Every structure is written in C-alpha cells, then in structure tokens.
Amino acid sequence: MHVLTLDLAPVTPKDAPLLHRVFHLSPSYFALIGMELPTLEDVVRDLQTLEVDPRRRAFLLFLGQEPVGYLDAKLGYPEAEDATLSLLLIREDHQGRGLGRQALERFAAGLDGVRRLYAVVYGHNPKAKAFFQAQGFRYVKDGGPTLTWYVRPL
Ligand SMILES: [Cl-]
C-alpha cells in the first residue's frame, strides 16, 4: 500500500533523532558533496540555530508516520522580498516517485507575498541541477567552485 500525500511538518530540536535517521538513510548525497554523515550532536546544533531565526522555514517530510525527507529554506534572502531553498532531500529509498516535486509545489503554494524562489546547489551535482531546471528554475550564476544558483518566479 502507498500513502500519496506528503505532509510538511515544521522541524523542532526534539526532531533531531528523526532528522538524523533521514540523513543516515541518504549516504549517497553526503558522499557526493564530500562530507561524512552528520553526527547527532551536529544535527541538534543545526536545529537550535534554525529555531531562533523567524525567517527559516524547515520541515520534516512525512508519508503518514514515516519521515522520508527534509526541506530547508530562508525567507528574505538574498533580498527581503525573496526566498531561497538551501536543501531539499528525499530519503534515498523513496527517490524517483515524484516526492521531490510534490514537496516543492506544496512549499511554494504557501509563499503568497514572496516574489522569487531561489535554489542553491552545492558541489558537482548535475542530477540536482537537472531536477531544478525541469521544475522551472533557470540558471542565474555560479557562486565560485562549490556553489550554483538558480531561480523561479512566483
Ligand atoms: Cl494519501
């Protein structure tokens, strides 16, 4: 059986163990960007940091009770009127079923009053670049060797 509708649950520091597990079930992403899997202590610290920023919009992605991804954006960056998506991750066993597109469309639906939505891609990740272009994000610039910027009007 399949749950179809993806729920976007706002993340809090008590979610650290669940977000840790999502990252640990996504090893290929961390290898691609040249990083060890995050420690639980690292995930806690990162959640404490986003907790105190009123403009961060971060979510665990749920199918029923199962955490199957993570979405992290910042309103008001690069400009006050815009938003930027810094991470969209679907757990590796749930990739290729349209959940990335669903998460993006559900998130963008909530941004009436925002002007443009940027996405920043880290490292040599052409698969992610192909995904964002397919969803209507055009290339803006590269941000040095490690970063590439894309944008979609709302
Ligand atoms: Cl459903």
From TrEMBL:
Q: Tell me which SUPFAM superfamilies the record gives.
A: Acyl-CoA N-acyltransferases (Nat)
Q: Which residues bind acetyl-CoA?
A: L88, I90, G96, G98, G100, R101, N125
The answer to whether UniProt assigns keyword RNA-binding to this entry is: no
In terms of InterPro entries, this protein maps to:
Acyl_CoA_acyltransferase (IPR016181), Bact_Acetyltransf (IPR050832), GNAT_dom (IPR000182)
Pfam family, any one: Acetyltransf_1
Q: Please name the GO terms that the record assigns under molecular function.
A: acyltransferase activity, transferring groups other than amino-acyl groups
Q: Which residues form the N-acetyltransferase domain?
A: 6-154
> Which keywords accompany this UniProt record?
Acyltransferase, Transferase
Q: What is this protein called?
A: Probable acetyltransferase
| Source organism per UniProt | Thermus thermophilus (strain ATCC 27634 / DSM 579 / HB8)
Source organism phylogeny:
Bacteria, Thermotogati, Deinococcota, Deinococci, Thermales
